[PDB]
Amino acid sequence: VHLTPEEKSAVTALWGKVNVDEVGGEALGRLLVVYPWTQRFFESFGDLSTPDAVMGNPKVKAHGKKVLGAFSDGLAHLDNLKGTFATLSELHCDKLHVDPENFRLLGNVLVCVLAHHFGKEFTPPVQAAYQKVVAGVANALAHKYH
Amino acid sequence: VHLTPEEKSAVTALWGKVNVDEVGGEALGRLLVVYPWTQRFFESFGDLSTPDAVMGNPKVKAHGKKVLGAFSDGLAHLDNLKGTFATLSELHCDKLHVDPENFRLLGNVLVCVLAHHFGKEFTPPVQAAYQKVVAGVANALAHKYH
Amino acid sequence: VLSPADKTNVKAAWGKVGAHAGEYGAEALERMFLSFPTTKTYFPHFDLSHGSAQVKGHGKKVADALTNAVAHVDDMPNALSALSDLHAHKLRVDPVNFKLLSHCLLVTLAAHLPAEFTPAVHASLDKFLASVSTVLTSKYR
Amino acid sequence: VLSPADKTNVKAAWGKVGAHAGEYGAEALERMFLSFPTTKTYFPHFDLSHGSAQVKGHGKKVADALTNAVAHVDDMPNALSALSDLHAHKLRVDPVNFKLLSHCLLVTLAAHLPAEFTPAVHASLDKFLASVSTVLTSKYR
Ligand code: HEM
Numbered sequence: 048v049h050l051t052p053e054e055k056s057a058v059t060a061l062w063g064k065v066n067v068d069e070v071g072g073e074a075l076g077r078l079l080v081v082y083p084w085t086q087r088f089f090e091s092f093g094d095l096s097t098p099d100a101v102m103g104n105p106k107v108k109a110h111g112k113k114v115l116g117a118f119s120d121g122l123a124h125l126d127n128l129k130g131t132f133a134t135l136s137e138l139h140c141d142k143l144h145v146d147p148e149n150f151r152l153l154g155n156v157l158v159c160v161l162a163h164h165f166g167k168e169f170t171p172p173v174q175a176a177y178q179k180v181v182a183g184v185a186n187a188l189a190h191k192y193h
Numbered sequence: 194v195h196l197t198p199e200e201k202s203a204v205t206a207l208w209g210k211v212n213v214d215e216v217g218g219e220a221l222g223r224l225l226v227v228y229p230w231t232q233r234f235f236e237s238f239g240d241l242s243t244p245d246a247v248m249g250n251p252k253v254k255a256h257g258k259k260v261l262g263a264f265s266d267g268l269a270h271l272d273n274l275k276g277t278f279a280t281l282s283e284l285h286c287d288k289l290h291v292d293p294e295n296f297r298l299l300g301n302v303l304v305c306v307l308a309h310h311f312g313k314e315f316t317p318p319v320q321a322a323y324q325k326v327v328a329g330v331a332n333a334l335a336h337k338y339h
Numbered sequence: 340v341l342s343p344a345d346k347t348n349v350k351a352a353w354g355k356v357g358a359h360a361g362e363y364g365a366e367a368l369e370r371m372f373l374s375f376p377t378t379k380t381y382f383p384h385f386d387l388s389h390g391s392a393q394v395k396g397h398g399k400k401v402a403d404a405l406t407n408a409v410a411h412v413d414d415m416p417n418a419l420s421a422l423s424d425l426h427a428h429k430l431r432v433d434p435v436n437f438k439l440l441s442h443c444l445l446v447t448l449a450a451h452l453p454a455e456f457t458p459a460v461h462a463s464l465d466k467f468l469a470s471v472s473t474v475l476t477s478k479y480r
Numbered sequence: 481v482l483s484p485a486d487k488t489n490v491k492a493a494w495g496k497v498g499a500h501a502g503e504y505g506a507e508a509l510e511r512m513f514l515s516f517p518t519t520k521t522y523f524p525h526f527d528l529s530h531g532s533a534q535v536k537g538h539g540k541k542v543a544d545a546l547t548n549a550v551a552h553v554d555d556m557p558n559a560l561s562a563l564s565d566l567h568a569h570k571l572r573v574d575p576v577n578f579k580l581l582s583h584c585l586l587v588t589l590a591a592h593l594p595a596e597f598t599p600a601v602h603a604s605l606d607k608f609l610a611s612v613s614t615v616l617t618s619k620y621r
Pocket residue numbers: 085088089110113114115117118135138139143145149150153184188
């Protein structure tokens with residue numbers, strides 16, 4: 048996408064403080080709790096019946112970590128998200144059949160998680176920068192659908 | 194945007210049969226009837242209180258014609274909608290304050306109007322091509338918002 | 340909220356659809372799969388090629404449900420109760436897709452009812468499809 | 481539909497908001513204008529710079545309305561009747577923007593209620609804001 052250098056440095060700085068494994072597990076878990084229809088892709092994962100079951104489910108945590116790790120790696124290529132995520136885009140379409148609306152939902156939950164985590168440090172300008180990034184990633188992941 | 198040559202020729206062929214003034218008046222009128230909150234920009238236009246008043250309102254017809262004419266001219270530059278609509282994009286943001294969601298609503302109403310007009314000639318593949326075009330135009334018009 | 344006039348408009352339009360309801364249902368689906376390819380992610384188990392029996396069959400089911408909704412327009416939540424359970428707990432289609440199908444249904448009706456699809460009827464039908472969509476997504480959470 | 485548990489969660493969270501409701505309302509607005517610039521098209525008559533009295537004033541009004549909705553969560557349509565008339569017939573804000581403000585309100589709450597903003601409360605709050613949004617857009621057509 049297009050971030051001003053001050054937006055880019057805002058995103059970069061905050062992300063250096065993120066425990067990717069922890070935030071990943073939290074974001075995926077909250078996605079499954081707040082928007083329960085997203086559970087549709089994960090019934091191989093065990094008990095998802097209550098909020099506590101979802102948040103404590105080890106498969107959810109593991110997958111959350113895998114997703115946010117790929118997300119992390121994309122922050123290093125903000126200039127070319129589409130190229131970075133082309134293969135994953137294809138995979139999510141052809142093999143996993145994930146409606147790309149799910150990427151948008153996850154992006155918004157991730158922003159809530161960052162806000163919860165960082166409190167007042169997650170200022171309005173920083174949120175704005177992260178919104179552009181998550182929209183960009185969702186875009187990039189949806190790009191090769193057909 | 195990106196149309197296959199068969200999509201491009203489908204769009205082009207159908208459009209050669211459109212009375213731009215008539216379809217323009219119809220599309221804008223139906224926008225104002227089906228989504229009445231869009232009337233917010235037009236209270237300078239007179240009586241918009243009933244469907245018949247809206248569809249017969251001469252200012253609505255005139256504006257519809259102006260809008261679809263610009264749309265028409267954009268069909269000639271499908272390769273570079275953003276460049277074609279940059280000035281209008283700016284105008285709609287800075288001076289007219291039109292929420293770009295309105296462009297999407299109009300695009301969908303325009304597709305309904307074409308379907309109503311052309312009946313069975315407006316096949317599923319032709320609709321698909323037009324959906325890409327109206328999304329592209331909405332995009333192009335929203336591009337310079339800030 | 341459907342006004343009495345909206346209900347009259349929907350019954351009139353759907354009345355004229357009559358026996359073609361199933362054929363129109365299939366056409367709307369095909370329009371949706373071509374115009375909004377993301378919707379195909381919910382049908383990986385179907386042959387989505389043109390004229391496929393699976394799509395025609397599904398189109399007929401969708402159409403019959405809408406017929407049921409028109410017949411019970413004053414009591415839709417009850418009439419569609421089993422269908423809202425099915426979409427909420429089983430199918431779990433993201434709510435945004437309901438809009439997309441609604442639009443394609445509207446386009447299909449427009450293409451087949453030249454005389455019936457007046458501005459006022461268009462408005463009533465869009466309202467009606469939004470209400471059906473709201474009921475079908477009622478129990479998602 | 482808000483379950484009793486959802487209502488308990490919303491009352492608890494909003495309770496902790498208490499007296500800061502107005503300040504949080506303004507922050508949510510500012511977040512919305514920066515993250516989703518298209519929403520500024522509804523406020524051309526405001527000074528939208530940081531700390532502007534107009535935004536703070538408006539934030540307080542938004543917050544008081546939400547406070548009113550929490551107090552009358554069993555009877556929201558009635559409680560917000562004047563506000564739904566106002567948005568439907570006067571302001572005519574496109575319904576998509578309600579989502580955007582709801583998200584920014586959620587972010588604001590998350591940033592200020594570290595202990596309260598559990599997964600279950602998050603879910604209840606999102607549901608609640610969606611219900612408020614539904615009521616405020618009820619009379620648009
Ligand atoms: C930030 C956005 C996302 C990114 C970066 C991402 C990335 C990934 C990666 C790296 C994998 C592993 C691929 C492999 O094995 O080769 C994966 C798998 C998968 N993802 Fe996504 N993903 C994202 C969002 C989502 C969302 C929102 C959902 C659905 C709610 C989803 C559902 C899945 C599923 C079901 C798999 C398969 C897991 C398995 O085999 O057990 N992903 N994703």
